[model samples]
Target: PQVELFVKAGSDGAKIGNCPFSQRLFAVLWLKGVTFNVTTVDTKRRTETVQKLCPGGQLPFLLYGTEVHTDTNKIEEFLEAVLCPPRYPKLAALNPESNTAGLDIFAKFSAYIKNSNPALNDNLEKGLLKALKVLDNYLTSPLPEEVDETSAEDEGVSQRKFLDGNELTLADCNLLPKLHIVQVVCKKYRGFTIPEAFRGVHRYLSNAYAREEFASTCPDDEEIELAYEQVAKALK
Candidate 1:
């Protein structure tokens, strides 16, 4: 198998990158049980190898045989097209429109993290809260008419165990890492926390962290903290 993944590395290349985007791709590959080589690119110093691999300097590029896949969304699509079930029957397909409901939350999180001024903190916090609420509603909301309820019921008392139903999907892969960053980064930097009111979002995050694939691929809290340490601090 000539499939290789190039992802951002920690200050030391041996450690997994704190980047949510890199972790997202890693989790997807692990969840799908894909056997591929991982090469960590040093984000702080863009080397010749990094530039040659991806002229645009994007981390998390995939090299599938002779073809190099850039852009996380397109790479995910390529993986889905190539690796969906029948080919890998035990692993369920990760892409579902329903699971993709909270896609914007990642951007909201980053935006909130980047704003250093105390004056804008309230608005940015609200922006992230609004997105989270939408996701919480989507997670707890009744399954669309198309899904077979009985199959979803087996996950236990909860109708929704993971986003889009009982099993993990690509959207879960994409959002969980960002949520982790929000949990750690926001709490550390801005004294913010995901409110107790959003039970659905809380439960969804708890469920995601429980999964071995997501857990194994996730970067540590210190790594996350260090990654954002350089960002201007938000004053109280």
Candidate 2:
């Protein structure tokens, strides 16, 4: 309802931003169809601008009047709070553990892409394949609805089209941005690719990217590459 969010802005004045986690927050807001003021920071002056606005100098933070919230997960909690009930019923209705499991897939894959040794040639194929194969099986199985719900909180069998469900849940919104990163950075840095082994997962991503909200709003791969290079320089 108030001043909504701040993200690390790209080199450009009017578009793109850093932080895959922050990117997810932006996508979720778009798909949810909520309106709020999002102030993007100049990454060149990240500390000067964002650190003055909020503590932690983190990638993403939300300003709700007097309270400033940090990190993607907590910021989404704020968004769900504001936009629930009449506006959007599916805000945080997705199962938490299910969403967590889905996100963990990206968390595993991205580690290798970000940490691979360029000098020694760390081809993250094995590590990346391990995560993808598990995800492929997770998505390839029948939809959760195919099985009976034994109780309000129990499903007799677990299967899914998207990360959390056939429908676009918070998990999809959260994971899609990370997916964009993996799709590009994995190949660029490690000479890796998302093989047909993850057909179900790949199909799920294709469907999401086909959507205008996701396709048009995703930050370009160049922006991500530049941002990553800057971070790498900072660390070294």
Candidate 3:
């Protein structure tokens, strides 16, 4: 295949790492029905292969033909531009409406996970819960008619199954992996969970988990746990 995705390797540097960003891209590619090769590079080691391919040793870079793309968001945009509609009519557009809902979740999750300070624990937990609350509310709410009109091309049994509508969008692709990370890592290290009360979030997760793209791209729970174990050691 001409499209190659270089992502962070697991502890063995041969398997997929627990990098949500990488998995997000993978899921987006899968959703778009794109055939691409995934190269797992050990970020910790930064091997000659990685250096040769990308001088900066970026974890998730796209190498298509002679052209290379870095920066995750830019890569996503590039993929959509090249692979969607008129350009490559066969593939689906992952971000049809540029939905920015719950965009801060990953950053909030990171801040919560990386924080080891006992004094700041409560504050971080509150921040994460607030984000989740907002996400749950969004999931439970209805979309505007214009949004619904555009999505009528897909599922007829609509009710906001994803961040946008019944169909999965780039927002879901970007957020689900991070949500998985939160579920896996926080429970293990922080003794935290998504709080069973967030039924909407739970349902949204269930919807994603049932999908072929998400199921295929999501890394193992063990992989996620192992990844955060290393991070826990260096928590700032």
Candidate 4:
């Protein structure tokens, strides 16, 4: 059976990140050769859809067989459990065991960026600096090595392509988008550099971005800018 996934599309009906979690999940689905449909919803018309499908009026919801799942993180987990189970299969698998590890890392990375919001207001430059620090610490940590080596040779890929090793698991997918977000958005808004120390991450991101799946599925800067604008407006 083909799964139906709904997403908010651009003015031309291109998909936007209804929630940040969709990108990596979509990539995983693509990788698994999962048969699915992408429904592009008009954001303005989303209320009716949400009322009927999701109890709360939010997006990035999934309609799986007979069940409906909301919450981007949970949706990601459900998708991994059902579609990409063998990719990473453990709680100890949080790093490389559970295919879920990449999503977890992305979640923490998201928090790191979010936590810098206040600093962003005061000094977008400094905020980005703080965020990059967090990323650098993660990339340089020993945890990724531990995770990379746990699974079978094929499954136990490194955190990224370079630096650590060449096992392209979900972790790389999860990290790439956020790293791109920082590179593009932070550079545009804050004038921050991508840090020479993170050459490994840079190489990994460049290769990941070059993939046809990522090229087709990743959100561009304009979409991100619009989302940020909406968020700023909503806060007022």
Candidate 5:
């Protein structure tokens, strides 16, 4: 049976939602090979159905059985209970044992960049460099082989284009949208680029962005820019 996901249409006038959190749920659903349906609410307008269930009005809440799970973190917890344990890459990003730097991290660094002033922050810049280093170091090293063999062989696709260098794990789903948003925001507004020096981070992002699922769910850059402008103002 397919699950029903309630997501906002984002803006009053926009076709696509500039909601990366929604994309996280979508990516997880798609990667887990689950069939599902979506209910798009025009957040600028009526949300009777959603508001009735999750009164706080966050986008991309799930309708599981007779209950609703709100927001990304809460919903992520719900998913973990229902699904297999998250793999190494994802665990490393959020866990103390695997996270050596022990600094707080973003599921998306782009949120800090996008929702802030056009200029970079000292900690933001430093933190991103560190994050890139972790990703690059892992990607450049030898990786574990895929547990499932013929899924690739049957499709005539032989390369490992994902961060784990094999399966599309939860980590990739969470991180890639951040990379995409920040990549666009930095290029258009900040006059910056993902350095060639961070080869593995760049490569991993390039490969993940090429996936059809990733491309389809990504909110339009202009729409996101409009949303980020709002977010920036609200923060100040």
Candidate 6:
């Protein structure tokens, strides 16, 4: 069966890394050797699509077979239970633990941005900096105890390679898209600098971007350009 996932074209605005959930789902599908097609929604029409398919008009909605699934965590569960099946060791190993923890982090990160009101454009840079600093701290921390045996080659060899040891779990995946936006938005709009302490996060993001699948799955540069244009206009 063919799977289709939808996402807005640019930075992680209200979408929580905008494209991270979709990218993570794509990565899991690839790991499981499942075939799928991904589509980018017209930014102007994206909200309508979400309202029709998702309960809360959110991006990153997944359509598998005939059923539409919302929420990144639940989508991952559905994929594991149905398409990939829990018997698959990798999928089974991650099942609930990775999904729940990853989703919780995503929710918190989303709340942080919403509370920060970076959309205000002025006085927003400080909040963005603070949020990015918090994320950098988390990324640099040692991986959780769960999958310590996994190797760097599996995910990548880097200071902040895996959120849980050598195994690439959903948590790492969830963090990247948001982090990507933080980097881009800071550089483009605020001229903010990523502190030297965030070296680990910087390395991890560079590594994530190096992956072909991730590179291809990321939001287009044009989308980001357009988003900035909109923000610039909004600020005026």
Q: Which one wins by TM-score: 2 or 4?
A: 2
Which 10 consecutive positions of candidate 1 have the poorest summed lDDT? 87-96
Which 10-residue window of candidate 3 scores lowest in summed lDDT? 89-98
Q: What is the full ranking by TM-score, best candidate first?
A: 1, 3, 2, 5, 4, 6
Which ranking of candidates, highest lDDT first?
1, 3, 2, 5, 6, 4
4 against 6, candidate with superior TM-score: 4
| Comparison by lDDT, 3 against 6, better one | 3
lDDT of 1 at 73: 81
Residue pairs with backbone overlap in model 4: 10-14, 88-97, 88-98, 88-99, 89-97, 90-93, 90-98, 93-97, 93-98, 157-167
lDDT of each: 0.78, 0.66, 0.78, 0.55, 0.63, 0.56
Candidate 1 or 2, higher TM-score?
1
TM-score of each: 0.83, 0.78, 0.83, 0.66, 0.72, 0.63
Cα lDDT of candidate 5 equals 0.63
Error of 1 at 223 (Å): 1.8
How well is each residue in 105-174 modelled by candidate 1, as lDDT tens digits? Answer: 8788888888877788889889999999988888776566435455544442235777777778777778
Taking the candidates one at a time, how many backbone clashes does each contain? 1, 0, 0, 10, 0, 0
**Residue 220 in model 6: shift from native, Å?**
1.9
The positional error of residue 180 in candidate 4, measured at the CA in angstroms, is: 2.2
Superposition TM-score, candidate 5 onto the true structure = 0.72
The Cα error of candidate 2 at residue 138, in Å, is 1.4
- RMSD of candidate 3 to the true fold? 4.7
